[PDB]
Design a protein around this nucleic acid. Structure first.
Ligand SMILES: [Mg+2]
Ligand SMILES: [Mg+2]
Ligand SMILES: [Mg+2]
Ligand SMILES: [Mg+2]
Ligand SMILES: [Mg+2]
Ligand SMILES: [Mg+2]
Ligand SMILES: [Mg+2]
Ligand SMILES: [Mg+2]
Ligand SMILES: [Mg+2]
Ligand SMILES: [Mg+2]
Ligand SMILES: [Mg+2]
Ligand SMILES: [Mg+2]
Ligand SMILES: [Mg+2]
Ligand SMILES: [Mg+2]
Ligand SMILES: [Mg+2]
Ligand SMILES: [Mg+2]
Ligand SMILES: [Mg+2]
Ligand SMILES: [Mg+2]
Ligand SMILES: [Mg+2]
Ligand SMILES: [Mg+2]
Ligand SMILES: [Mg+2]
Ligand SMILES: [Mg+2]
Ligand SMILES: [Mg+2]
Ligand SMILES: [Mg+2]
Ligand SMILES: [Mg+2]
Ligand SMILES: [Mg+2]
Ligand SMILES: [Mg+2]
Ligand SMILES: [Mg+2]
Ligand SMILES: [Mg+2]
Ligand SMILES: [Mg+2]
Ligand SMILES: [Mg+2]
Ligand SMILES: [Mg+2]
Ligand SMILES: [Mg+2]
Ligand SMILES: [Mg+2]
Lengths: 80, 123, 86, 82
RNA sequence: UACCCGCAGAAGAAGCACCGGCUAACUCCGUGCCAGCAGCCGCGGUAAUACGGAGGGUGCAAGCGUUAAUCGGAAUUACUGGGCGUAAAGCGCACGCAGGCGGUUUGUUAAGUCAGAUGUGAAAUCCCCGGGCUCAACCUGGGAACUGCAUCUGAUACUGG
RNA sequence: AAAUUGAAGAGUUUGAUCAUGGCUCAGAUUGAACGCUGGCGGCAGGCCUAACACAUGCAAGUCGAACGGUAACAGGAAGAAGCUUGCUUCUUUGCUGACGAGUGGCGGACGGGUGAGUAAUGUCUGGGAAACUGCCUGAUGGAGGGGGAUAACUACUGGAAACGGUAGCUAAUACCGCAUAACGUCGCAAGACCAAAGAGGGGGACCUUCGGGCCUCUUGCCAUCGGAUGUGCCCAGAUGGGAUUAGCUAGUAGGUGGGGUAACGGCUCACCUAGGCGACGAUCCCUAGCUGGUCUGAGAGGAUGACCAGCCACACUGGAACUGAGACACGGUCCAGACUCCUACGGGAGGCAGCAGUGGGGAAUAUUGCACAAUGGGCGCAAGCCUGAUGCAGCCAUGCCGCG
């Protein structure tokens, strides 16, 4: 039972943290067009191994800071 | 020791905050009013929704002064500023319904009994 | 207060308040002695002080003045630090 | 605690009770956990009038749910009926 | 109290709006661009079914009208479901970032999309078939519905990588 | 078997026409009002406005089976007598049925009211992990031996009242040591450390200091691990409008460590890094409790959030914590503000958005009623007591349905 998210690294500046963006398509409730929506998550990156632009697999965990409730599971693709 | 032009604070909930004395009542060429004395006042500042308004012309009784009051053994009671209680122009009875700060027993008149009862403290 | 028991409750809660205050102030005192030893670098004074503190953070927990977890952290925390020095 | 009791629905002069398991503090006709029977005191008794899921009642008792005086009666009455 | 029996006598119990077209219901008298009506059109200066009274009639009925108020009809904000030459509507013209969209083949992925399974989607309400108050409103059993969300496992044509 | 299997158009621009386009009507619906009129009943609804202000009653108590106890009333009693010799009244003594005031326990965090605030420490949907949790419940063991107090009361005394001041004096399931101490907490471990309370019902040999011992059962108390219920916390999506608001941010975003909470966490502090948010609408401004659902529509939508139920928020206004399992407390406390009431003038007291009721505002919305008989809540072993929850009744054609 390993619920997980996949997204790409938009910021790697913070010490041991990263900002990840999860993008998805969604049907528009009224006009039916499929629209891009993005969800940015502050995620934990102990060891700072995640570079900007990387594609990373993340999971939900307990609060790590005022805004971090997610941590890194592993890198998928890097340095496009 | 209040005269024309003197400014007084206000020791009630009439809504007035600053009043000017424009007449010392009670005699020709009378110079000063003190605790217990009635004055004519204009209102120079009042709160937004009170019983009176800026520029209204009325009476007031002085209840605290810097010059103070002498008591019969020689004593003095002085206050850090001058305050008064607003009075109806005709009935010379209090406009407000509450009194703030200390007053003195010199007010014990038939006329000002209501002010000493309401006062937090009586000296 | 207006109701008969409400009056009584205010009286009882004040008594309890002065009871709890007294025991609580005592307890923090004995906790503070340990942190003071630590900040002066003495193993013995700090271990000694920890031993006096132990039974009373435990007891005040049993007595509901504090919860069990609070008593534990205090013991955990102080124990961590004193060991880290001597 | 958790209690099994009658929440009074129906209409004026025509009471109809819904047997419910609930936190005893919630209002009588308010929040409940599980519905477990009903009780019509005005049933013609030509057909039905009192129905209890005794299996779930017992399950809740087994976990410490208490029982109304009136539900305790219904249960003895229904146990007698069959 | 519900309900049942007895007594007296039709005895104590009918009003409101409307009748020119839209709109079911027409005549006379009074008035004369006055007094007045009027949801919209529009009635009123000597035959006014439109004003006001009357008789007659129409529609409702312990209510009937007027006012207020939401949605409907309104495809009149148009996703379903509209338009821009002359009716309201093409920016005076071009370049262009963001954005939207993107020719054709293979492989890959499996987010969109599709399938299945599981959990959840409180009860009441709505709907269906029953049950109980003399009926109905009302009360109530069971169902169906909650067209949604989430997890897992698949499918890979189309869209995305 | 059945359970969205449903959809209308008319008048009005023109001399007339077709198109365009607005206005208007037929329909359902309403917490309605006003005008005319008005018989009965069943069920429902009833301040939409001023989260304006409130006189009076009532809305939270209960347990003598925790405790010292008697002041009321009720008996009982050696002994006083009513004495007309079994009927009795009072002096007495808590002897007991009870019970005012007091300590103590459990409840005053529920039930009930409101929608001001809040575009998010909210709600709805769906998930998480770091937690506590009275009463009820399963499991296993404790429940040993002590100590110093105190209200009531007594004496003296201050107040107009509210409510106090001295010194006495005493009980407990009030309060504190000491012992005991693991499947508990801390610790790698070795070890170290933590609790408690009695009260009743009945009784066979047996007997005393006639209190009871002792026998027995009920019940409460302590510890630990669970169950159930409740609650706290975290993430994602959704949940109003405005750019005639485009930049916002120093506890700010993250890191380390100390502190802190029941618990994760910039929750807090120091130090360090310089981040974090934003055109996928941040910031600022306006408005607003959210939902189930309600009304309308064939539907998709539009409008809406009384009555019922779920969540939240508030309790005169602003702030605060104390007690407690739970509150930052609707009829608790403290401070400040606004306001009102009492006063013998020195000082006191209170908060209907609980149920009635009053003034005010308004086009407009009810009785200062009966009962705990029923359901349900609090306390109690129970009997029972309390319950403006609730069940009912009154008022109004306000609506629905039935009948005259
Ligand atoms: Mg720490
Ligand atoms: Mg016709
Ligand atoms: Mg007419
Ligand atoms: Mg004519
Ligand atoms: Mg209308
Ligand atoms: Mg439309
Ligand atoms: Mg068009
Ligand atoms: Mg041409
Ligand atoms: Mg044109
Ligand atoms: Mg052009
Ligand atoms: Mg393949
Ligand atoms: Mg029938
Ligand atoms: Mg049904
Ligand atoms: Mg059902
Ligand atoms: Mg449902
Ligand atoms: Mg492709
Ligand atoms: Mg014409
Ligand atoms: Mg009338
Ligand atoms: Mg009624
Ligand atoms: Mg009211
Ligand atoms: Mg008593
Ligand atoms: Mg104790
Ligand atoms: Mg010990
Ligand atoms: Mg003991
Ligand atoms: Mg930390
Ligand atoms: Mg508001
Ligand atoms: Mg209500
Ligand atoms: Mg109401
Ligand atoms: Mg509700
Ligand atoms: Mg407050
Ligand atoms: Mg506490
Ligand atoms: Mg609250
Ligand atoms: Mg109140
Ligand atoms: Mg009026």
């Amino acid at each position: 039972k390993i619920r997980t998210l996949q997204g790409r690294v938009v910021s790697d500046k913070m010490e041991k943290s990263i900002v990840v963006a999860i993008e998805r398509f969604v049907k528009h409730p009224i006009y039916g067009k499929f629209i891009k929506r993005t969800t940015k998550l502050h995620v934990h990156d102990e060891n700072n191994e995640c570079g900007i632009g990387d594609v990373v697999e993340i999971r939900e965990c307990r609060p790590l800071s005022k805004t971090k409730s997610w941590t890194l599971v592993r890198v998928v693709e890097k340095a496009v | 020791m209040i005269q024309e032009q003197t400014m007084l604070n206000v020791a009630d909930n009439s809504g007035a905050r600053r009043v000017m004395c424009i007449k010392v009542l009670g005699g020709s060429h009378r110079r000063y009013a003190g605790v217990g004395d009635i004055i004519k006042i204009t209102i120079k500042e009042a709160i937004p929704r009170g019983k009176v308004k800026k520029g209204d012309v009325l009476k007031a009784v002085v209840v605290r002064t810097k010059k103070g009051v002498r008591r019969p053994d020689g004593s003095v009671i002085r206050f850090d500023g001058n305050a008064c209680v607003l009075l109806n122009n005709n009935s010379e009875q209090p406009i407000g319904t509450r009194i703030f700060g200390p007053v003195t027993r010199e007010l014990r008149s038939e006329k000002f009994m209501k002010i000493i009862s309401l006062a937090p403290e009586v000296l | 207060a207006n109701i008969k028991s409400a009056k009584k409750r205010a009286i009882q809660s004040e008594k309890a308040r002065k009871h709890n205050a007294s025991r609580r102030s005592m307890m923090r005192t004995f906790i503070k002695k340990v942190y003071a030893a630590i900040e002066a670098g003495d193993k013995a004074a700090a271990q000694k002080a920890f031993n006096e503190m132990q039974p009373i953070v435990d007891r005040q927990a049993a007595k509901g003045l504090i919860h069990k977890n609070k008593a534990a952290r205090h013991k955990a925390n102080l124990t961590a630090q004193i060991n880290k020095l001597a | 605690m958790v209690t099994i009791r009658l929440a009074r629905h129906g209409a004026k002069k025509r009471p109809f009770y819904q047997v419910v398991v609930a936190d005893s503090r919630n209002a009588r006709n308010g929040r409940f956990i599980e519905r477990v029977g009903f009780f019509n005191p005005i049933a013609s008794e030509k057909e039905e009038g009192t129905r209890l899921d005794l299996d779930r009642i017992a399950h809740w008792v087994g976990q410490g749910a208490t029982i109304s005086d009136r539900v305790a009666a219904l249960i003895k009455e229904v146990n007698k009926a069959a």
